[PDB]
C-alpha cells in the first residue's frame, strides 16, 4: 500500500486478512488503485491482473473485495481497462486472464461490473507462432473463450445482460471468431473434435442472432474465409467438417453444405453445395488455393475429402480429358513440325524467298505454323504472368518448375527468327537448341491418366537435390585423382594430337592432359603396363581408384534405388493425382470457364437458398452413394 | 528417461526435480528441463558426451532422442553448430 512492491506481494499472496482497512487509507489519502505508481513502469500491470495471475485453485476470494475497493475509489472503468504498455504483451485486460485461467465466476463478476469485452490483445505474445508469438486466439475475449475450449464462457459472453460480445466482431487482422478458431486448430483428434464442435455452436448461435447474413462470410484482411483459411493453412479436420456440414433445424438449416436430395431405399443422392469450392475465377476458390498453392502441408488428403475428388473426376470427364489429349497431340504435332522445318532448313542458313514449288510451300507452311505455335505459347505465358489472383497466393512460376521452359522456348524461337532475318552463320545454333528444350517439355507432359511414368518426380528432385551435390563431389574426387596421377606420371614428337604423353614434364595446358586422363579412365581399358617406370605405387593407387569407384558407385546407387522404390509409395500416386488436378485446373483457367461448361446447378429457392456463395440457386454437385442402414 | 523427466510437487522435496514448469498460457506449456548435468562445458563429464561419443552403448539412439537431448542437439546445431 505504502509502496507498490508490498501491495503486489500482498495481492499475490492471496490473503484478504491483510487487505482489510487499507481502503480507508486509500480513500483518505486520495490514493486510487488505478494510479500510475501502483503499476510497474515496465508493463503497466495493476493489482487485479496480478491477483488473477496468482489464482489459488481457481479460488481467490479477495477479488470481490478488490472490485468493491476499486468502485469505492471512484475509478472502475479505467481499473478494468488496463492495457499492458509493454511490447511483449498488450491489452490483456483482467477479463482475458479470467477467461484464460478456466474460471467462469470471476469472469461473471468482471462483466457484472462492466468489464470491457472487446479489449484487443494486440500483443507480440499473441501473434501466431510464425510472427514470434506463442498463442494466437483472435485477440478478443470471446475468441479467447472460443479457442481454449470454454463453451460456458462463450455462452455467457454471448447473452450477458451487460455489454454484449457480438461474434461478428473481428480483430485487427479481420479474423473473426471462426477465423481464429481455425487458426488454432490442428489435425489431431481432441483438437479437431472441440474446434469443430465449437465452430458449429458459434455459427448456429450467430445465425440465430442475425439470420440476415452468414457469419462464415466475414473475410479477414487477406480476404479469405474460414473454409478457405483452413484450406490455405492446411487444417484437414476443420476443412472436412465445414465441407460436410448439414443442419436440421430450418431456422439454421440454410447454412448447410451437404444437403440431401432424394433417397430410394439404400440409395442416397447427397447434394454437396460447392458454392465456394469454385467461382469460375470470379472470386478465389478453395480448389485453386488447395491445389495450385504448393506450400500446403496436407495437400493430398484435403484434395481427396469428398466433393473435391468427385469434382475433379467430373471436370476430367467433361472438357478435362478431351482437351488434354487435344493439347498434347497439338503440341506433339508442333514439335514434329519444328523438327522438320529445322532439319529441312535451307543449307547453311542462307534464308532466301524461294517459296514457289510444292515442297518449298510445305517448308514455308511448317515454318509459319511453328512461329504461330511459338507466339501462341508466349501469349499464354504473358497472360499467366499478368493474371495474379492475390499477392502471396499466385503461380509465381518464374525460375521454377516448367513455365520457364515455355518462356525460354519462345525466347529462343524469337531470337532465331531475328537472326534468320539477319541470316548470320553460327547463330542459328539456338534453333537446334530450342528444339532440344522443346522435347524436354514433352517429358513434363504425360502427367494425366494411365499411371504415367514418374520421370517428373525424379527430374523434379535430381534437378536440385542430393544427386547434384553427389555428382559434384564425384567430379571433385575424379579430378583430384587426375591431378594426382598426372603429377606422378609427369616425368620424339610421337605424332599425337595432345602435345606429349608426359615425356619428361612436357606440360602445356592443364585441361589438355586432364581431359586425356579423364577419357582414358572413363573408357577404363587399354591399361598402362610398360616396364620398370617407377614403383608399384601408381598401379596401387589406380587399382584402389577403380575398385572404390566401381564398388561404391554401384552399391550406393543400388541402395538409393532400394530407398527410392521403398519411398515411391502411395505418396507417388499422390503426386500423380496432384499433377492431374493441376492439368484439369489450368486447362479450365486457360479458356473462359463461366461459359456453359461449368458444374451442375441445383435447387433454386427456399429449401436450397442461402447466402454462402452464388445466388439462391446455390450451384451444387450431387454425388450418389449407397448405405445399408 | 524417468530421471531426465522427473518433477516433484511437494516443496520440501521439489528442489530435486529436472522438468520444471516455467509458464502456461492456456494450451501452451514452456517446460523447462534442467540440464544441470547433461553438459558441463567439459568441466565434468556430461551425459551427452558419455551417451554419444561412447560407441559401446546398447541403446545409443533411443536414449539420444529422449527429449532434452534431441532439442539440445538441435539448438546447438542452430547456434555455432551448423555455421
Q: Do B25 and A147 touch (CB under 8 A)?
A: no
Q: Binding site membership of A: which residues?
A: 45, 50, 54, 89-92, 101-104, 149-152, 197, 525
Contacting residues for A254 by C-beta, under 8 A, at least 6 apart:
A207, A609, A610, A611
Q: Do B28 and A134 touch (CB under 8 A)?
A: yes
Q: Binding site membership of A for Ca(2+): which residues?
A: 525
CA A506 to CA A409: how far, in whole Å?
Answer: 46
Q: Do A148 and B28 touch (CB under 8 A)?
A: no
Domain CATH number, residue A142 = 1.25.40.20
Mutate to test the interface with A, among B25, B29, B30, B31 (most CBs of A within 10 A): B25
CA A230 to CA A285: how far, in whole Å?
Answer: 12
Adjacent-strand bridge partners of B3: none
Residue A20: name the closest of A71, A81, A62, A57 by CA: A62
Contact A182, A238 (CB under 8 A): yes
Cα dihedral sign for A36, A40, A41, A44? negative
After which residues, if any, is chain B broken (C to N > 2.5 Å)?
Answer: none
CA A337 to CA A324: how far, in whole Å?
Answer: 20
CA A315 to CA A581: how far, in whole Å?
Answer: 9
Q: Do A100 and B27 touch (CB under 8 A)?
A: no
> Cα A423 from chain centroid?
48
- For residue A305, what are the CA distances in angstroms to A236, A286, A302, A424? 9, 12, 5, 58
CA A589 to CA A591: how far, in whole Å?
Answer: 6
Contacting residues for A449 by C-beta, under 8 A, at least 6 apart:
A316, A321, A580
> Which residues of chain A have a CB within 8 Å of the CB of B30?
134
| Chain B closest-CA separation from residue A117 CA (Å) | 19
Q: Counting beta carbons within 10 angstroms of the beta carbon of residue A281, is it exposed (0 to 12), middle (13 to 18) or buried (19 or more)?
A: middle
Nearest CA in chain A to B27: A148
- For residue A119, what are the CA distances in angstroms to A45, A202, A205? 15, 20, 22
Contact A215, A199 (CB under 8 A): no
**What was the experiment behind these coordinates?**
cryo-EM
| Chain B closest-CA separation from residue A148 CA (Å) | 7
Contacting residues for A364 by C-beta, under 8 A, at least 6 apart:
A355
- Find the domain containing A65 and state its range: 4-309
C-alpha cell at A192: 479437431
In units of Å, what resolution does this entry have? 3.6
CA A414 to CA A373: how far, in whole Å?
Answer: 12
Q: What is the b/e burial string over A570-604, where b = at least 16 CB atoms within 10 angstroms of the residue's CB?
A: eeeeebbbbbbbebbbebbbeeebeeeeebeebbe
Angle at A172 (CA atoms; ends A166, A174), nearest 5 degrees: 65
Question: Phi and psi dihedrals of B29, rounded to 5?
Answer: -125, 125
> Which residues of chain A have a CB within 8 Å of the CB of B28?
134-135
CA A226 to CA A241: how far, in whole Å?
Answer: 12
- What DSSP assignment string belongs to A327-342? HHHHHHHHHHHHHHHH
> B-side interface with A, Cβ within 8 Å?
25-28, 30
Contact A452, A446 (CB under 8 A): yes
> Cα A516 from chain centroid?
50
> A-side interface with B, Cβ within 8 Å?
100, 125, 134-135, 137, 147-148, 184
Count chain A–chain B contacts defined by CB atoms under 8 A: 15
Amino acid at each position: 500500500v505504502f509502496n507498490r512492491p508490498i501491495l503486489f506481494d500482498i495481492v499475490s499472496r492471496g490473503s484478504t486478512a491483510d487487505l482489510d482497512g487499507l481502503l480507508s487509507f486509500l480513500l483518505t489519502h486520495k490514493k486510487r488503485l488505478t494510479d500510475e505508481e501502483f503499476r510497474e513502469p515496465s508493463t503497466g500491470k495493476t493489482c487485479l491482473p496480478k491477483a488473477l495471475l496468482n489464482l489459488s485453485n481457481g479460488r481467490n476470494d479477495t477479488i470481490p473485495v478488490l472490485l468493491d475497493i476499486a468502485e469505492r475509489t471512484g475509478n472502475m472503468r479505467e481499473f478494468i481497462n488496463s492495457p499492458f504498455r509493454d511490447i511483449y504483451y498488450r491489452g490483456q485486460t483482467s477479463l482475458h486472464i479470467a477467461i484464460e485461467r478456466r474460471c467462469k465466476h470471476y469472469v461473471e463478476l468482471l462483466v457484472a461490473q462492466g468489464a470491457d469485452v472487446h479489449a484487443q490483445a494486440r500483443g507480440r505474445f499473441f501473434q501466431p507462432k510464425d510472427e514470434g508469438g506463442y498463442f494466437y486466439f483472435g485477440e478478443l475475449p470471446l475468441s479467447l473463450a472460443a479457442c481454449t475450449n470454454q463453451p460456458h464462457i462463450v455462452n455467457y459472453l454471448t447473452e450477458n445482460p451487460h455489454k454484449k460480445a457480438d461474434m461478428r466482431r473481428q480483430d485487427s487482422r479481420g479474423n473473426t471468431v471462426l477465423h481464429a478458431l481455425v487458426a488454432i486448430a490442428d489435425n489431431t483428434r481432441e483438437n479437431t473434435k472441440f474446434v469443430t464442435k465449437m465452430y458449429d455452436l458459434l455459427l448456429l448461435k450467430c445465425s440465430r442472432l442475425f439470420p440476415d447474413s452468414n457469419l462464415e462470410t466475414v473475410l479477414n484482411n487477406d480476404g479469405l474465409s474460414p473454409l478457405m483459411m483452413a484450406a490455405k493453412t492446411g487444417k484437414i479436420g476443420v476443412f472436412q467438417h465445414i465441407i460436410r456440414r448439414e443442419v436440421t433445424d430450418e431456422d439454421t438449416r440454410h447454412l448447410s453444405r451437404k444437403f440431401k436430395d432424394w433417397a430410394y431405399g439404400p440409395v442416397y443422392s447427397s447434394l454437396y453445395d460447392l458454392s465456394s469450392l469454385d467461382t469460375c475465377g470470379e472470386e478465389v476458390s478453395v480448389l485453386e488455393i488447395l491445389v495450385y498453392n504448393s506450400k500446403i502441408e496436407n495437400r493430398h488428403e484435403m484434395l481427396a475429402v469428398e466433393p473435391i475428388n468427385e469434382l475433379l473426376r467430373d471436370k476430367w470427364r467433361k472438357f478435362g480429358a478431351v482437351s488434354f489429349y487435344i493439347n498434347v497431340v497439338s503440341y506433339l504435332c508442333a514439335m514434329v513440325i519444328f523438327t522438320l522445318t529445322a532439319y529441312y532448313q535451307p543449307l547453311e542458313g542462307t534464308p532466301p524467298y524461294p517459296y514457289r514449288t510444292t515442297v518449298d510451300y510445305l517448308r514455308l507452311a511448317g515454318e509459319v505454323i511453328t512461329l504461330f505455335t511459338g507466339v501462341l505459347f508466349f501469349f499464354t505465358s504473358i497472360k499467366d504472368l499478368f493474371t495474379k489472383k492475390c499477392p502471396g497466393v499466385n503461380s509465381l512460376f518464374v525460375d521454377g518448375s516448367f513455365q520457364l521452359l515455355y518462356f525460354i522456348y519462345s525466347v529462343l524461337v524469337v531470337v532465331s527468327a531475328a537472326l534468320y532475318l539477319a541470316g548470320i552463320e553460327a547463330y542459328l545454333a539456338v534453333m537446334v537448341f530450342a528444339l532440344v528444350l522443346g522435347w524436354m517439355n514433352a517429358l513434363y507432359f504425360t502427367r494425366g491418366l494411365k499411371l504415367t511414368g514418374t520421370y517428373s518426380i525424379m527430374i523434379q528432385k535430381i534437378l536440385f537435390k542430393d544427386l547434384f551435390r553427389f555428382l559434384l563431389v564425384y567430379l571433385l574426387f575424379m579430378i583430384g585423382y587426375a591431378s594426382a596421377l598426372v603429377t606422378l606420371l609427369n616425368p620424339q614428337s610421337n605424332c599425337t594430337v595432345p602435345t606429349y604423353p608426359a615425356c619428361r614434364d612436357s606440360e602445356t595446358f592443364s585441361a589438355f592432359l586432364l581431359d586425356l586422363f579423364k577419357l582414358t579412365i572413363g573408357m577404363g581399358d587399354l591399361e598402362m603396363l610398360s616396364s620398370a617406370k617407377y614403383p608399384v605405387v601408381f598401379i596401387l593407387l589406380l587399382v584402389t581408384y577403380i575398385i572404390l569407384t566401381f564398388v561404391l558407385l554401384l552399391n550406393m546407387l543400388i541402395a538409393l534405388m532400394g530407398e527410392t522404390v521403398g519411398q515411391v509409395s502411395k505418396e507417388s500416386k499422390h503426386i500423380w493425382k496432384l499433377q492431374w488436378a493441376t492439368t484439369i485446373l489450368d486447362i479450365e483457367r486457360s479458356f473462359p470457364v463461366f461459359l456453359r461448361k461449368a458444374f451442375r446447378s441445383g435447387e433454386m429457392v427456399t429449401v436450397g437458398k442461402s447466402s454462402d456463395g452464388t445466388p439462391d440457386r446455390r450451384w451444387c454437385f450431387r454425388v450418389d452413394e449407397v448405405n445399408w442402414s
